[PDB]
Amino acid sequence: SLIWGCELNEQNKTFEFKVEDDEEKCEHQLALRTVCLGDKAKDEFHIVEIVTQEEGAEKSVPIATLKPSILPMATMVGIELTPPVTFRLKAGSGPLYISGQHVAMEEDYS
Amino acid sequence: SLIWGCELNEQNKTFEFKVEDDEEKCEHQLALRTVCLGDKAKDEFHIVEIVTQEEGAEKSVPIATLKPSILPMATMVGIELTPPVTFRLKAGSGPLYISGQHVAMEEDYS
Amino acid sequence: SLIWGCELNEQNKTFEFKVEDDEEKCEHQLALRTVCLGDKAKDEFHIVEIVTQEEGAEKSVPIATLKPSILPMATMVGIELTPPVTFRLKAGSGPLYISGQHVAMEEDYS
Amino acid sequence: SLIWGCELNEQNKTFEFKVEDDEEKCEHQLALRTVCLGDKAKDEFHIVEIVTQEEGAEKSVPIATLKPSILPMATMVGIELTPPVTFRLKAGSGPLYISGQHVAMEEDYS
Amino acid sequence: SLIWGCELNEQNKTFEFKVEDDEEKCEHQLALRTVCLGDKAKDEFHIVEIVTQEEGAEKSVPIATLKPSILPMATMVGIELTPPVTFRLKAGSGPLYISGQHVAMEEDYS
């Protein structure tokens, strides 16, 4: 369980949890823990979602909704991602920081 | 675990998590994760429930209650649905978006 | 897991989760999920508790405390009741609706 | 799982979860569930902790922090005590009620 | 499960969960439970994080964000640390108290 974090904002509205092609050989995940508003986040309900594809029709996984006045930070426990997995802001301007741990296995290279 | 979402509102007060009859042959579920108020949701306590039937007397499963000022979004973890399962708004006007993952198994069609 | 709900208020200050004597033969439970204030609930901290008996001295299990302005609804996860189990309002006027699922096993009556 | 509750306040700043010496022969616990402010609690952040001893240097286990305006009640799930275990108010005046279930095993005395 | 707590503030912006080299021989952890603002904490969103190192590029694990007016205290359940693990305040002035239990095994020294 290496440890992972990123942000989504108007400057980084989209992101991606992707593991290196060499590293992707193993089973890799990203077990998310928390999502917290950034310093430049607007006072509105910013929504973090995932972008993927199903049956050719565009789709996304809503992850969280945050607002500094009510819910600036929430616990994203029970949410895991199998890389590659795109990140997007369904709503808001960010920065919405997403935390977690990149679960990655490594072979014996000794 | 394909990934799933819908909304309930005055325009869609009722919905249903149903898997296709061909797909229903396998064990299908919908493990819910979160429920979040929509952009057009009223500032009141909107309640999301499920509609089913027991012993011929009408019944529903209350899923969540949300309000933009207090609890616009909640985590619907530990809630799973076996399709078909109707959705309804016990109270409110919506849109109340319900998230989750449609757990579906597929046979080898190669 | 049949599904269950009730309310406690000045009209129903006390209630009971009881399974029928014929049904009680099996192991029956009521896994609670959520507790939500009713439409007629006062703007105060209404407390839901259970009534039982220990060593002959009167006792109760506090389940929840709710207020429309702060915590109108809470998740009563991890709380399970073995029938019969009385319900009472430690404080408040209700209606405080208690949700859950009545876990009940049935024999083969074919 | 017998069921347990107590309060800590200026009148009862300290308490203890202790099982009777005769009962202590078995493995006894107190799985805590919730902590809620009392009727006489002040509008400040009252902190509930445990008192014990380690390596001869005084120590305590902070359990919770509550305030009527923000967090009058919280879920103390995942917290278990092995009796005897002293209770104290790290901060506040109480009453802070602590809930739970005293898990106790009994031999066959028939 | 010995029991553990510390604080991070302008006076202690950095800390560390480290087990003694003699004690480190066994598998040691620190299962965190809660994080609560101190008496001298400013009315802003103080962020607690961990400091470590990955692939030579500096990094940290954000643990929590707290504010007395909204979220003075939160439950840090599901978070565990393998010593040594540095603590830092990503934002804020503290004191932000971090609770938990130091899980430590000891050999038979009789």
CA distance E15 to chain A (A): 19
Query: Is the CA virtual torsion C68, C77, B18, A52 positive or negative?
Result: positive
CA E61 to chain A, closest CA, distance in angstroms equals: 7
- C1 Cβ contact partners less than 8 Å away, ≥ 6 residues apart: C31, C101, C102, C103
Q: What residue type is assigned to position C47 of the chain? A: I
User: Is chain B adjacent to chain C, meaning 3+ CB pairs within 8 angstroms?
Assistant: yes
User: Which residue on chain C is closest to B65 by alpha carbon?
Assistant: C73
- How far apart are alpha carbons B14 and B88 in whole angstroms? 4
Distance CA E30, CA E81 (A): 5
B36 vs A59, A62, A78: nearest CB: A62
Nearest to D65 among E3, E33, E36 (CB): E36
Domain that holds residue E45: 4-103
D108, part of any domain:
no
Neighbors of chain D with 3 or more C-beta pairs under 8 Å: C, E
Residues of chain C whose C-beta is under 8 A from some C-beta in B? Answer: 2-3, 5, 33-34, 36, 70-73, 75, 77, 97, 99
- D22 by Cβ neighbours in 10 Å (0-12 / 13-18 / 19+) ranks as exposed
The SS3 call for residue A3 is coil
Chain A residue whose CA is closest to E62: A99
Separation CA B97–CA B74 (nearest Å): 11
Q: Based on C-alpha coordinates, what's the Rg of chain A?
A: 15
Distance from CA of E60 to the nearest CA of D (A): 26
Greatest Cα-to-Cα distance within chain A, rounded to the nearest angstrom: 52
D17: β partners = D85
Report the distance separating Cα C89 and Cα C68, nearest Å.
Answer: 16
DSSP-derived letter for residue E13 is S
Angstrom distances, CA of residue C27 to CA of C7, C82, C85, C105, E97: 24, 8, 14, 7, 44
Report the alpha-carbon distance of residue C11 to residue C3 in Å, rounded.
23
Of A65, A59, A63, the closest CA to residue A17 belongs to: A63
Instruction: Give domain status of residue E110, yes or no.
Output: no
Number of domains in chain C: 1
Burial category of B73 from C-beta neighbours within 10 Å (exposed 0-12, middle 13-18, buried 19 and up): buried
- Output the six-digit token pair for E67: 């504010």
CA B64/CA B87 separation, integer angstroms: 12
Q: Chain D contacts of E72, Cβ < 8 Å? A: 45, 65, 67, 70-71
Asked whether residue A17 is domain-assigned, the answer is yes
Q: Residue B108: inside a domain, yes or no?
A: no
Kindly state the DSSP code that residue B45 receives in the 8-state scheme: -
Q: Strand, helix or coil at B24?
A: helix
Q: Coil, strand, or helix at residue B21?
A: coil
Alpha carbon of C58: minimum distance to chain B alpha carbons (Å): 33
> Which of C54, C65, C78 comes nearest D33 by C-beta?
C78
Evaluate the CA torsion angle A26, A31, A35, A38 in order and state its sign.
negative
CATH of the domain at A55: 2.60.120.340
For A41, the 3-state DSSP assignment is coil
Contacts of C73 in chain B (CB under 8 A): 45, 65, 71
Q: Do at least 3 CB pairs under 8 Å connect A with E?
A: yes
Tokens of B71: 């609890």
Listed in sequence order, the residues at least 6 apart from D20 whose beta carbon sits closer than 8 Å to its beta carbon are none
Nearest to D37 by CA among D66, D4, D17, D69: D66
Contact at CB, A33 and E59, closer than 8 angstroms:
no
State the pairing for strand pair C14-17/D73-81: unpaired
Q: Quick check: C42 and C83 in contact, CB under 8 A? A: no
N residues, chain E: 110
Q: According to the entry, how was the structure determined? A: cryo-EM
SS (H, E, C) chain C: CCCEEEEECCCCCEEEECCCCCHHHCCCEEEEEEEEECCCCCCCCEEEEEEEEECCEEEEEEEEEEECCCECEEEEEEEEECCCEEEEEEECCCCEEEEEEEECCCCCCC
Residues of B with CB under 8 A from a CB of C: 45, 47, 52, 54, 59, 61-62, 64-65, 67, 70-71, 74, 78-79
Is A75 contained in some domain?
A: yes
Cα–Cα distance for residue pair A12/C6, rounded to 1 Å: 48
Q: How far is the CA of A51 from the CAs of A58, A109, B32, in angstroms?
A: 8, 34, 18
Quickly tell me which residue has 């909107």 as its tokens. B46
C108 belongs to a structural domain: no
Structure letter (DSSP) for residue E67? B
Nearest CA in chain A to B72: A65
In chain A, what residues touch B3 (CB-CB under 8 Å)?
50, 52, 54, 59, 61
Q: Is residue A30 part of a domain?
A: yes
Contact D34 C62 (CB under 8 A): yes
| 3-class state of residue E65 by DSSP | strand
How many whole angstroms separate alpha carbon E99 and alpha carbon D58? Answer: 16
E65 to A77: CB separation less than 8 angstroms, yes or no:
no
**Hey, what are A51's tokens?**
């972008």
In a domain, C23, yes or no: yes
Cα of E75 to nearest chain D Cα, Å: 9
State how far residue C61 is from chain B, nearest Cα, in angstroms.
Answer: 23
Rounded Cα distance between B46 and B65, Å, is 5
Q: How many helices (H) and strands (E) does chain B have?
A: 0, 8
